[PDB]
mmCIF file of C-alpha atoms (C1' of nucleotides) and ligand atoms in Angstrom:
data_model
loop_
_atom_site.group_PDB
_atom_site.id
_atom_site.type_symbol
_atom_site.label_atom_id
_atom_site.label_comp_id
_atom_site.label_asym_id
_atom_site.label_seq_id
_atom_site.Cartn_x
_atom_site.Cartn_y
_atom_site.Cartn_z
ATOM 1 C CA UNK A 9 0.000 0.000 0.000
ATOM 2 C CA UNK A 10 3.023 2.271 0.551
ATOM 3 C CA UNK A 11 5.659 -0.261 1.218
ATOM 4 C CA UNK A 12 5.698 -1.154 -2.416
ATOM 5 C CA UNK A 13 4.244 2.030 -4.009
ATOM 6 C CA UNK A 14 7.108 3.143 -6.380
ATOM 7 C CA UNK A 15 7.539 -0.416 -7.621
ATOM 8 C CA UNK A 16 3.986 -0.732 -8.372
ATOM 9 C CA UNK A 17 3.514 2.675 -9.691
ATOM 10 C CA UNK A 18 6.449 2.245 -11.992
ATOM 11 C CA UNK A 19 5.115 -1.166 -13.097
ATOM 12 C CA UNK A 20 1.817 0.403 -13.847
ATOM 13 C CA UNK A 21 3.372 3.149 -15.871
ATOM 14 C CA UNK A 22 5.156 0.463 -17.881
ATOM 15 C CA UNK A 23 1.978 -1.513 -18.247
ATOM 16 C CA UNK A 24 -0.120 1.275 -19.460
ATOM 17 C CA UNK A 25 2.476 2.192 -21.849
ATOM 18 C CA UNK A 26 2.481 -1.221 -23.487
ATOM 19 C CA UNK A 27 -1.122 -1.467 -23.919
ATOM 20 C CA UNK A 28 -1.482 2.187 -25.385
ATOM 21 C CA UNK A 29 1.496 3.259 -27.391
ATOM 22 C CA UNK A 30 2.286 -0.351 -28.409
ATOM 23 C CA UNK A 31 -0.118 -3.043 -28.977
ATOM 24 C CA UNK A 32 1.435 -5.490 -26.405
ATOM 25 C CA UNK A 33 -1.466 -6.924 -24.428
ATOM 26 C CA UNK A 34 0.988 -9.541 -23.262
ATOM 27 C CA UNK A 35 3.719 -7.363 -21.759
ATOM 28 C CA UNK A 36 0.999 -5.194 -20.906
ATOM 29 C CA UNK A 37 -0.642 -8.046 -19.040
ATOM 30 C CA UNK A 38 2.752 -9.004 -17.568
ATOM 31 C CA UNK A 39 3.385 -5.718 -15.853
ATOM 32 C CA UNK A 40 -0.057 -5.940 -14.367
ATOM 33 C CA UNK A 41 -0.150 -9.209 -12.557
ATOM 34 C CA UNK A 42 3.373 -8.408 -11.425
ATOM 35 C CA UNK A 43 2.343 -5.101 -10.195
ATOM 36 C CA UNK A 44 -0.587 -6.930 -8.626
ATOM 37 C CA UNK A 45 1.437 -9.460 -6.665
ATOM 38 C CA UNK A 46 4.251 -7.188 -5.487
ATOM 39 C CA UNK A 47 1.468 -5.092 -4.037
ATOM 40 C CA UNK A 48 0.127 -7.727 -1.776
ATOM 41 C CA UNK A 49 3.664 -8.591 -0.620
ATOM 42 C CA UNK A 50 3.882 -7.859 3.020
ATOM 43 C CA UNK A 51 7.460 -6.647 3.082
ATOM 44 C CA UNK A 52 9.862 -4.224 1.566
ATOM 45 C CA UNK A 53 11.208 -5.420 -1.705
ATOM 46 C CA UNK A 54 14.905 -4.886 -1.344
ATOM 47 C CA UNK A 55 16.095 -6.167 -4.645
ATOM 48 C CA UNK A 56 15.160 -7.826 -7.774
ATOM 49 C CA UNK A 57 15.880 -11.336 -6.779
ATOM 50 C CA UNK A 58 13.633 -10.999 -3.790
ATOM 51 C CA UNK A 59 10.788 -9.912 -5.984
ATOM 52 C CA UNK A 60 11.863 -12.407 -8.493
ATOM 53 C CA UNK A 61 10.632 -15.160 -6.201
ATOM 54 C CA UNK A 62 7.242 -13.860 -6.826
ATOM 55 C CA UNK A 63 4.804 -15.542 -9.031
ATOM 56 C CA UNK A 64 4.471 -13.343 -12.080
ATOM 57 C CA UNK A 65 7.902 -11.880 -11.684
ATOM 58 C CA UNK A 66 10.601 -12.818 -13.896
ATOM 59 C CA UNK A 67 13.870 -11.776 -15.145
ATOM 60 C CA UNK A 68 12.344 -8.842 -17.100
ATOM 61 C CA UNK A 69 10.720 -6.905 -14.365
ATOM 62 C CA UNK A 70 13.310 -7.798 -11.654
ATOM 63 C CA UNK A 71 15.845 -6.070 -13.646
ATOM 64 C CA UNK A 72 13.634 -3.067 -13.682
ATOM 65 C CA UNK A 73 13.050 -3.343 -10.074
ATOM 66 C CA UNK A 74 16.780 -3.283 -9.581
ATOM 67 C CA UNK A 75 17.406 -0.141 -11.656
ATOM 68 C CA UNK A 76 14.592 1.490 -9.942
ATOM 69 C CA UNK A 77 15.690 0.359 -6.488
ATOM 70 C CA UNK A 78 19.226 1.261 -7.276
ATOM 71 C CA UNK A 79 18.719 4.769 -8.928
ATOM 72 C CA UNK A 80 15.464 6.669 -8.291
ATOM 73 C CA UNK A 81 14.354 6.172 -11.847
ATOM 74 C CA UNK A 82 14.260 3.939 -14.834
ATOM 75 C CA UNK A 83 15.519 4.674 -18.343
ATOM 76 C CA UNK A 84 12.576 3.293 -20.274
ATOM 77 C CA UNK A 85 10.444 5.359 -18.099
ATOM 78 C CA UNK A 86 12.562 8.395 -18.654
ATOM 79 C CA UNK A 87 12.532 7.721 -22.365
ATOM 80 C CA UNK A 88 8.695 6.985 -22.597
ATOM 81 C CA UNK A 89 7.862 10.085 -20.596
ATOM 82 C CA UNK A 90 9.825 12.275 -22.983
ATOM 83 C CA UNK A 91 8.666 10.628 -26.230
ATOM 84 C CA UNK A 92 6.513 12.678 -28.314
ATOM 85 C CA UNK A 93 4.511 10.068 -29.996
ATOM 86 C CA UNK A 94 3.792 8.371 -26.850
ATOM 87 C CA UNK A 95 2.712 11.597 -25.111
ATOM 88 C CA UNK A 96 0.539 12.425 -28.052
ATOM 89 C CA UNK A 97 -1.428 9.257 -27.771
ATOM 90 C CA UNK A 98 -1.860 9.611 -24.133
ATOM 91 C CA UNK A 99 -3.430 12.973 -24.680
ATOM 92 C CA UNK A 100 -5.762 12.474 -27.686
ATOM 93 C CA UNK A 101 -7.052 9.643 -25.720
ATOM 94 C CA UNK A 102 -8.499 12.293 -23.323
ATOM 95 C CA UNK A 103 -11.206 13.116 -25.661
ATOM 96 C CA UNK A 104 -14.448 11.326 -25.137
ATOM 97 C CA UNK A 105 -14.630 9.066 -28.047
ATOM 98 C CA UNK A 106 -11.044 8.591 -28.802
ATOM 99 C CA UNK A 107 -9.605 5.442 -27.637
ATOM 100 C CA UNK A 108 -6.062 4.268 -28.132
ATOM 101 C CA UNK A 109 -6.769 2.747 -31.348
ATOM 102 C CA UNK A 110 -7.922 5.840 -32.866
ATOM 103 C CA UNK A 111 -5.271 7.789 -30.954
ATOM 104 C CA UNK A 112 -2.561 5.780 -32.641
ATOM 105 C CA UNK A 113 -4.097 6.330 -36.023
ATOM 106 C CA UNK A 114 -4.503 10.089 -35.683
ATOM 107 C CA UNK A 115 -1.013 10.496 -34.605
ATOM 108 C CA UNK A 116 0.204 8.501 -37.395
ATOM 109 C CA UNK A 117 -1.583 10.798 -39.728
ATOM 110 C CA UNK A 118 -0.112 13.689 -37.717
ATOM 111 C CA UNK A 119 -2.918 14.722 -35.417
ATOM 112 C CA UNK A 120 -1.373 15.252 -32.130
ATOM 113 C CA UNK A 121 -2.930 18.437 -30.990
ATOM 114 C CA UNK A 122 -6.373 19.614 -29.989
ATOM 115 C CA UNK A 123 -6.032 22.104 -32.703
ATOM 116 C CA UNK A 124 -5.128 19.352 -35.109
ATOM 117 C CA UNK A 125 -8.120 17.744 -34.117
ATOM 118 C CA UNK A 126 -10.102 20.779 -35.058
ATOM 119 C CA UNK A 127 -8.748 21.257 -38.554
ATOM 120 C CA UNK A 128 -9.784 17.780 -39.136
ATOM 121 C CA UNK A 129 -13.105 17.542 -37.521
ATOM 122 C CA UNK A 130 -14.012 15.624 -40.615
ATOM 123 C CA UNK A 131 -11.959 12.620 -39.668
ATOM 124 C CA UNK A 132 -13.880 12.397 -36.488
ATOM 125 C CA UNK A 133 -17.225 10.644 -35.923
ATOM 126 C CA UNK A 134 -20.188 12.070 -34.050
ATOM 127 C CA UNK A 135 -19.109 10.995 -30.584
ATOM 128 C CA UNK A 136 -15.654 12.361 -31.044
ATOM 129 C CA UNK A 137 -17.076 15.502 -32.391
ATOM 130 C CA UNK A 138 -18.947 16.198 -29.316
ATOM 131 C CA UNK A 139 -16.082 15.101 -27.186
ATOM 132 C CA UNK A 140 -13.875 17.578 -28.902
ATOM 133 C CA UNK A 141 -16.545 20.174 -28.695
ATOM 134 C CA UNK A 142 -16.885 19.916 -24.926
ATOM 135 C CA UNK A 143 -13.363 18.853 -24.076
ATOM 136 C CA UNK A 144 -13.111 21.562 -21.406
ATOM 137 C CA UNK A 145 -16.569 20.945 -19.863
ATOM 138 C CA UNK A 146 -16.053 17.224 -19.924
ATOM 139 C CA UNK A 147 -12.900 17.373 -17.907
ATOM 140 C CA UNK A 148 -14.662 19.361 -15.076
ATOM 141 C CA UNK A 149 -16.079 17.843 -11.930
ATOM 142 C CA UNK A 150 -19.736 18.303 -11.211
ATOM 143 C CA UNK A 151 -20.377 20.249 -8.009
ATOM 144 C CA UNK A 152 -22.983 18.546 -5.944
ATOM 145 C CA UNK A 153 -24.809 21.918 -5.616
ATOM 146 C CA UNK A 154 -25.403 21.519 -9.345
ATOM 147 C CA UNK A 155 -26.071 17.810 -9.116
ATOM 148 C CA UNK A 156 -29.075 18.819 -6.986
ATOM 149 C CA UNK A 157 -30.435 21.135 -9.602
ATOM 150 C CA UNK A 158 -30.008 18.542 -12.324
ATOM 151 C CA UNK A 159 -31.618 15.820 -10.238
ATOM 152 C CA UNK A 160 -34.361 18.179 -9.520
ATOM 153 C CA UNK A 161 -35.040 18.464 -13.188
ATOM 154 C CA UNK A 162 -34.707 14.929 -14.332
ATOM 155 C CA UNK A 163 -37.034 13.653 -11.735
ATOM 156 C CA UNK A 164 -39.747 16.109 -12.491
ATOM 157 C CA UNK A 165 -40.006 15.380 -16.098
ATOM 158 C CA UNK A 166 -39.743 11.608 -15.647
ATOM 159 C CA UNK A 167 -42.738 11.992 -13.560
ATOM 160 C CA UNK A 168 -44.557 14.255 -15.860
ATOM 161 C CA UNK A 169 -44.231 11.818 -18.632
ATOM 162 C CA UNK A 170 -45.360 8.922 -16.640
ATOM 163 C CA UNK A 171 -45.971 8.792 -13.006
ATOM 164 C CA UNK A 172 -45.295 5.116 -13.039
ATOM 165 C CA UNK A 173 -41.542 5.734 -13.550
ATOM 166 C CA UNK A 174 -39.025 5.077 -10.857
ATOM 167 C CA UNK A 175 -35.786 7.117 -11.368
ATOM 168 C CA UNK A 176 -32.726 7.249 -9.086
ATOM 169 C CA UNK A 177 -29.587 9.129 -9.482
ATOM 170 C CA UNK A 178 -26.827 6.707 -8.577
ATOM 171 C CA UNK A 179 -23.083 7.087 -8.254
ATOM 172 C CA UNK A 180 -20.898 8.940 -5.681
ATOM 173 C CA UNK A 181 -23.581 11.536 -5.631
ATOM 174 C CA UNK A 182 -25.978 9.089 -4.156
ATOM 175 C CA UNK A 183 -23.204 8.219 -1.620
ATOM 176 C CA UNK A 184 -22.959 11.893 -0.292
ATOM 177 C CA UNK A 185 -20.123 12.961 -2.698
ATOM 178 C CA UNK A 186 -19.142 16.604 -2.899
ATOM 179 C CA UNK A 187 -18.677 16.456 -6.577
ATOM 180 C CA UNK A 188 -19.091 13.946 -9.264
ATOM 181 C CA UNK A 189 -17.865 13.217 -12.713
ATOM 182 C CA UNK A 190 -21.208 12.642 -14.410
ATOM 183 C CA UNK A 191 -24.774 12.079 -13.782
ATOM 184 C CA UNK A 192 -25.955 8.414 -13.886
ATOM 185 C CA UNK A 193 -29.725 7.974 -13.703
ATOM 186 C CA UNK A 194 -31.148 4.353 -13.209
ATOM 187 C CA UNK A 195 -34.534 3.796 -14.425
ATOM 188 C CA UNK A 196 -37.270 1.283 -14.641
ATOM 189 C CA UNK A 197 -40.875 0.909 -14.948
ATOM 190 C CA UNK A 198 -43.511 -1.587 -13.811
ATOM 191 C CA UNK A 199 -44.636 -2.507 -17.239
ATOM 192 C CA UNK A 200 -40.899 -3.477 -17.869
ATOM 193 C CA UNK A 201 -39.139 -6.527 -16.454
ATOM 194 C CA UNK A 202 -37.076 -9.765 -17.070
ATOM 195 C CA UNK A 203 -39.643 -11.281 -19.463
ATOM 196 C CA UNK A 204 -42.114 -8.607 -20.826
ATOM 197 C CA UNK A 205 -40.737 -8.236 -24.339
ATOM 198 C CA UNK A 206 -39.203 -4.845 -23.942
ATOM 199 C CA UNK A 207 -40.732 -1.410 -24.436
ATOM 200 C CA UNK A 208 -38.191 0.835 -26.153
ATOM 201 C CA UNK A 209 -40.300 3.924 -26.088
ATOM 202 C CA UNK A 210 -40.015 3.580 -22.400
ATOM 203 C CA UNK A 211 -36.459 4.942 -22.619
ATOM 204 C CA UNK A 212 -37.217 7.072 -25.526
ATOM 205 C CA UNK A 213 -40.249 8.821 -24.075
ATOM 206 C CA UNK A 214 -38.188 10.147 -21.350
ATOM 207 C CA UNK A 215 -35.209 11.049 -23.420
ATOM 208 C CA UNK A 216 -37.530 12.964 -25.571
ATOM 209 C CA UNK A 217 -38.881 14.895 -22.773
ATOM 210 C CA UNK A 218 -35.456 15.892 -21.434
ATOM 211 C CA UNK A 219 -34.437 17.275 -24.784
ATOM 212 C CA UNK A 220 -37.867 18.674 -25.104
ATOM 213 C CA UNK A 221 -37.268 21.128 -22.285
ATOM 214 C CA UNK A 222 -33.566 21.548 -23.264
ATOM 215 C CA UNK A 223 -31.885 19.621 -20.512
ATOM 216 C CA UNK A 224 -30.276 17.104 -22.794
ATOM 217 C CA UNK A 225 -28.472 18.827 -25.596
ATOM 218 C CA UNK A 226 -26.629 16.131 -27.476
ATOM 219 C CA UNK A 227 -26.572 12.416 -27.990
ATOM 220 C CA UNK A 228 -23.518 10.349 -27.865
ATOM 221 C CA UNK A 229 -25.446 7.153 -28.041
ATOM 222 C CA UNK A 230 -29.038 6.193 -27.716
ATOM 223 C CA UNK A 231 -30.344 2.659 -27.898
ATOM 224 C CA UNK A 232 -33.230 0.691 -26.452
ATOM 225 C CA UNK A 233 -31.919 0.563 -22.971
ATOM 226 C CA UNK A 234 -28.994 2.839 -22.496
ATOM 227 C CA UNK A 235 -28.913 6.466 -23.556
ATOM 228 C CA UNK A 236 -25.647 8.377 -23.386
ATOM 229 C CA UNK A 237 -25.871 12.101 -23.839
ATOM 230 C CA UNK A 238 -24.805 15.541 -22.698
ATOM 231 C CA UNK A 239 -26.897 17.885 -20.576
ATOM 232 C CA UNK A 240 -26.870 21.355 -19.268
ATOM 233 C CA UNK A 241 -28.366 23.631 -16.697
ATOM 234 C CA UNK A 242 -30.319 26.474 -18.020
ATOM 235 C CA UNK A 243 -27.990 29.204 -18.006
ATOM 236 C CA UNK A 244 -30.015 31.407 -15.741
ATOM 237 C CA UNK A 245 -30.177 35.156 -16.052
ATOM 238 C CA UNK A 246 -27.094 35.640 -18.238
ATOM 239 C CA UNK A 247 -23.484 36.244 -17.197
ATOM 240 C CA UNK A 248 -23.080 32.630 -16.110
ATOM 241 C CA UNK A 249 -23.784 29.722 -18.438
ATOM 242 C CA UNK A 250 -23.289 26.245 -17.181
ATOM 243 C CA UNK A 251 -20.753 23.716 -18.393
ATOM 244 C CA UNK A 252 -21.877 20.779 -20.557
ATOM 245 C CA UNK A 253 -22.257 17.640 -18.482
ATOM 246 C CA UNK A 254 -22.077 13.979 -19.383
ATOM 247 C CA UNK A 255 -25.166 12.148 -18.681
ATOM 248 C CA UNK A 256 -26.322 8.500 -18.857
ATOM 249 C CA UNK A 257 -29.711 6.950 -18.474
ATOM 250 C CA UNK A 258 -30.507 3.238 -18.409
ATOM 251 C CA UNK A 259 -33.748 1.333 -18.478
ATOM 252 C CA UNK A 260 -34.163 -1.620 -16.214
ATOM 253 C CA UNK A 261 -36.505 -4.389 -15.791
ATOM 254 C CA UNK A 262 -38.210 -3.395 -12.703
ATOM 255 C CA UNK A 263 -37.537 -6.793 -11.536
ATOM 256 C CA UNK A 264 -33.854 -6.022 -11.214
ATOM 257 C CA UNK A 265 -33.800 -2.381 -10.139
ATOM 258 C CA UNK A 266 -32.389 -2.326 -6.527
ATOM 259 C CA UNK A 267 -29.722 -4.881 -7.246
ATOM 260 C CA UNK A 268 -28.570 -2.636 -10.035
ATOM 261 C CA UNK A 269 -29.230 0.271 -7.897
ATOM 262 C CA UNK A 270 -27.203 -1.244 -5.179
ATOM 263 C CA UNK A 271 -24.445 -1.956 -7.462
ATOM 264 C CA UNK A 272 -24.057 1.348 -9.129
ATOM 265 C CA UNK A 273 -24.196 3.206 -5.854
ATOM 266 C CA UNK A 274 -20.994 1.508 -5.019
ATOM 267 C CA UNK A 275 -18.639 1.948 -3.745
ATOM 268 C CA UNK A 276 -16.465 -0.456 -5.614
ATOM 269 C CA UNK A 277 -15.279 -1.691 -2.205
ATOM 270 C CA UNK A 278 -18.619 -1.805 -0.374
ATOM 271 C CA UNK A 279 -19.694 -3.826 -3.266
ATOM 272 C CA UNK A 280 -17.034 -6.384 -3.137
ATOM 273 C CA UNK A 281 -17.349 -6.488 0.584
ATOM 274 C CA UNK A 282 -21.066 -6.706 0.248
ATOM 275 C CA UNK A 283 -20.597 -9.384 -2.309
ATOM 276 C CA UNK A 284 -18.102 -11.303 -0.318
ATOM 277 C CA UNK A 285 -20.553 -11.223 2.500
ATOM 278 C CA UNK A 286 -23.528 -12.687 0.639
ATOM 279 C CA UNK A 287 -21.280 -15.735 -0.100
ATOM 280 C CA UNK A 288 -20.932 -16.757 3.474
ATOM 281 C CA UNK A 289 -24.481 -15.921 4.072
ATOM 282 C CA UNK A 290 -25.258 -18.620 1.459
ATOM 283 C CA UNK A 291 -25.685 -16.425 -1.612
ATOM 284 C CA UNK A 292 -24.476 -14.618 -4.600
ATOM 285 C CA UNK A 293 -24.969 -11.109 -5.806
ATOM 286 C CA UNK A 294 -24.463 -9.471 -9.204
ATOM 287 C CA UNK A 295 -25.657 -6.363 -11.059
ATOM 288 C CA UNK A 296 -29.117 -7.949 -11.392
ATOM 289 C CA UNK A 297 -30.006 -10.455 -8.818
ATOM 290 C CA UNK A 298 -29.301 -12.387 -5.678
ATOM 291 C CA UNK A 299 -29.462 -16.146 -5.915
ATOM 292 C CA UNK A 300 -29.353 -18.605 -2.934
ATOM 293 C CA UNK A 301 -26.390 -20.801 -3.058
ATOM 294 C CA UNK A 302 -26.757 -24.578 -3.247
ATOM 295 C CA UNK A 303 -24.283 -26.985 -1.758
ATOM 296 C CA UNK A 304 -23.451 -28.869 -5.016
ATOM 297 C CA UNK A 305 -20.992 -26.115 -5.554
ATOM 298 C CA UNK A 306 -23.340 -23.611 -7.039
ATOM 299 C CA UNK A 307 -26.989 -22.859 -7.620
ATOM 300 C CA UNK A 308 -29.528 -20.354 -9.096
ATOM 301 C CA UNK A 309 -33.023 -19.033 -8.201
ATOM 302 C CA UNK A 310 -33.355 -15.209 -8.161
ATOM 303 C CA UNK A 311 -34.658 -13.983 -4.979
ATOM 304 C CA UNK A 312 -37.474 -11.406 -5.008
ATOM 305 C CA UNK A 313 -36.332 -7.865 -4.237
ATOM 306 C CA UNK A 314 -38.668 -4.838 -3.529
ATOM 307 C CA UNK A 315 -35.992 -2.496 -2.085
ATOM 308 C CA UNK A 316 -32.306 -2.073 -1.200
ATOM 309 C CA UNK A 317 -33.385 -3.437 2.129
ATOM 310 C CA UNK A 318 -34.513 -6.933 0.944
ATOM 311 C CA UNK A 319 -31.092 -7.436 -0.492
ATOM 312 C CA UNK A 320 -29.565 -6.612 2.914
ATOM 313 C CA UNK A 321 -32.050 -8.650 4.974
ATOM 314 C CA UNK A 322 -31.340 -11.564 2.757
ATOM 315 C CA UNK A 323 -27.669 -11.478 3.644
ATOM 316 C CA UNK A 324 -28.692 -10.527 7.117
ATOM 317 C CA UNK A 325 -26.812 -7.314 7.399
ATOM 318 C CA UNK A 326 -27.308 -3.810 8.619
ATOM 319 C CA UNK A 327 -29.014 -1.455 6.158
ATOM 320 C CA UNK A 328 -26.313 0.932 5.266
ATOM 321 C CA UNK A 329 -27.348 4.355 4.163
ATOM 322 C CA UNK A 330 -25.720 5.178 0.942
ATOM 323 C CA UNK A 331 -23.751 7.778 2.794
ATOM 324 C CA UNK A 332 -21.810 5.004 4.427
ATOM 325 C CA UNK A 333 -21.575 2.613 1.522
ATOM 326 C CA UNK A 334 -18.042 3.813 1.207
ATOM 327 C CA UNK A 335 -16.513 0.402 2.095
ATOM 328 C "C1'" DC B 1 -18.836 -7.467 -19.290
ATOM 329 C "C1'" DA B 2 -22.649 -5.435 -21.985
ATOM 330 C "C1'" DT B 3 -24.478 -2.204 -24.993
ATOM 331 C "C1'" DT B 4 -23.959 0.948 -29.238
ATOM 332 C "C1'" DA B 5 -21.653 2.991 -33.418
ATOM 333 C "C1'" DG B 6 -19.409 2.172 -37.313
ATOM 334 C "C1'" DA B 7 -17.669 0.521 -41.457
ATOM 335 C "C1'" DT C 1 -19.775 -9.128 -39.046
ATOM 336 C "C1'" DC C 2 -16.112 -7.317 -35.982
ATOM 337 C "C1'" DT C 3 -13.875 -4.219 -33.610
ATOM 338 C "C1'" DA C 4 -13.762 0.204 -30.830
ATOM 339 C "C1'" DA C 5 -15.048 2.944 -26.809
ATOM 340 C "C1'" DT C 6 -17.708 3.940 -22.458
ATOM 341 C "C1'" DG C 7 -19.100 2.575 -18.314
HETATM 342 NA NA1 NA D 1 8.925 -16.212 -10.402
HETATM 343 NA NA1 NA D 2 -11.111 9.198 -24.581
#
DNA sequence: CATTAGA
DNA sequence: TCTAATG
């Protein structure tokens, strides 16, 4: 956690670099399990050889561990860090829509800058266009104060369209968070569940409304169950317009709301921990259900959930307010 | 680890 | 169809 920090951090740098600038999923996977194991290791790695004993660590990495242990750096790292091409890819990649694959390509063609990207908006698809368009806004955190106004809006319309709709803003925001990266609304309806052959308009009706009143202002991707746009707070009485925020909305079979809802509220750790718990308690939990475990090794049989509570009760735990779902 | 664009 | 990118 801090005993092996540099080593891991270096290893991760290396990893990430393989995967992105180069297409070396292997090396790239190497550096990762290595970085994974050395992390767990309960003592101070004092040399390569020591590390070397570790599963996942071989001659390659050890040698890096030495250089790094020896002199506070690493050449490859010093080289990579400096390297234009490499830096370029790491950056383009910042744009919503541009992955590594495309980042490599662009660069190859000579697009390395945001400006480059402009002059060639043409080479970019829709997504990427928006991403480039709101690059600044997209990189900004969402102040909870604002989250509150947005939630205020989304809920109201959802309702207006159909009062039968159940919407919940999930994420860190749900967990008390001072700021957030983007708004994630979870949604379901009664007439929509596990079996009931869909109802696409269900997602659509609402999306339509949001755009209708100008809350949603762009569409990165809209399908029958997941919508992925951009929204914005009505820039009040001039002088202060609001930044463009990422927003996602997902339809859910009512019969699998809360599990999902649980899930997305996080945190990543409370989850795991919640999940690990259910196991002892004779269960299993996943993004959609909670099935009683059977002794034969495994089992199925989706238990009936009406609220976050039921899930808890099942595993016989203490209802934990989102606020404290931090771990 | 699943859903969507795209080509 | 696959392969990318987000989450
Ligand atoms: Na080894
Ligand atoms: Na990106």
